[model samples]
Target: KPKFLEYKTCVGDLTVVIAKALDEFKEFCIVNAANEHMTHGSGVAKAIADFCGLDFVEYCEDYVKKHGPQQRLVTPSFVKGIQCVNNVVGPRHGDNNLHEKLVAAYKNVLVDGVVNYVVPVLSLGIFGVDFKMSIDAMREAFEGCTIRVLLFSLSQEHIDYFDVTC
Candidate 1:
């Protein structure tokens, strides 16, 4: 059913998942059916490449500005309600118990079908970092990883965009 499962972390974007999969292995096509954008070529790939010590990537306009080659952005300000804002660190690296939530999402996705490996791209709200939750998801799903409670916060855009028809 499963050979060896690995989960990679991300803010939940197509590029990150694909890049991480390729980097870790060699090449693999990521499923984007569930993504609202349904996009494969985005800036998320570039970010993953940068994180992985790679030399080539095609970054999206917005993603490049933040996590680009020049590296114009730093840790970024942690204002509440922003998508990537992190007031605290969690088990993996920072305080946002994002890893725990990813575990929950992965279990939910795999009940329908057995997932060999997963790459999760999750967003906090807005104006914040998006993290890939794949690696942590596998550990939690099969290995009984511990819990991590993300700092509770909400963004105005969440409500504003809730009923979007597009």
Candidate 2:
């Protein structure tokens, strides 16, 4: 019973558990954020922070102040509003024209020396498949270190929501 086969709430709950487990093990953390439009912000970071009574602004602002406003995924003011962990794991170098930027972002944050523990949000290539086919690619991209993935949506509504031929 992989996550995709589980309930949506189960996935959300598992993410909470993952965050707690990581918090006990690591100090520096990095979230692989999906595009703002997809996750609708926070993807699980803010949720976990709220659950722990931690200030969400503290985590988001830390990234903003350290990396500047451009690096923020939740916008300049809505860091606390974000509920899920954000990460950069998506298709690139095909025709979307975002390969290099994503590579540089990953290197600067994960490989270079800025953060520890990468939690990636895998939200693509899932409709007929249980999860994204590119998940392996994402895993390979990060390679080492503690990593967790929050699947996209499990509901069938995704087809209607994402379908362009409606």
Candidate 3:
């Protein structure tokens, strides 16, 4: 069973459940909000590499180079054991359209029925900037499928910004 058995937040039934440990999921597909380069530097890329291994990163890089790295929405590569939807949305190349891109990506992933369990933890994007917008997008795109968003202790400022408490 999915580790965190409880779901509670301002978003109601559509609330983004956040806790820990994604490897526990059996039929879940993760969303990786990565950079254009899909490097192993930080954020989702790093976490995924740590969890799955470096081969995954190399696979993604090779795919991006050949498939022309998607910005708005694109499924780069899907790993066997732990599936992943490479969501390359960020301002690494000075692209200020990450918000819209994230929304579109969520829509595609959900509407397409990519996976029953979707881990949208990377929705926060680079430096947790797209938190609110991304949450709204998920709420809109969600199609009764379970969605898991990672939650870590945040400061009061972040709590206020993300608007999630209790």
What number of clashing residue pairs does each candidate have, in the order they appear?
28, 20, 0
1-166: candidate 2 lDDT, tens digit per residue: 1222111111335355355434543432435444322222464444434443434456554665666544335322223322334344344334243433344444333433323343443434323222323333333454453433323333434323323221
The RMSD (Cα, Å) of candidate 1 is: 16.5
Compared with the true structure, model 1 gives a TM-score of 0.27
- Across 2-36, the per-residue lDDT of candidate 1 in tens digits comes to 34433333333434444444455343222211222
How does each model score on TM-score?
Answer: 0.27, 0.39, 0.56
The whole-model lDDT of each prediction reads 0.31, 0.38, 0.47
In the order shown, what is each candidate's alpha-carbon RMSD? 16.5, 10.0, 6.9
Superposed by TM-score, candidate 1 places the C-alpha of residue 29 at a distance from the truth, in angstroms, of 9.2
List candidate 2 segments past 4 Å from native: 1-15, 18-42, 45-54, 58-69, 72-115, 122-134, 144-166
Model 2 whole-model lDDT (C-alpha atoms): 0.38
Most TM-score-accurate candidate? 3
Residue 141 CA error for candidate 2 (Å)?
A: 2.1
Task: Tell me the tens digit of each residue's lDDT in model 3 across 28-112.
Answer: 4555556666665775456655555666767767767887756533343344634455454544435467666555655555424
**What is the TM-score ranking, best to worst?**
3, 2, 1
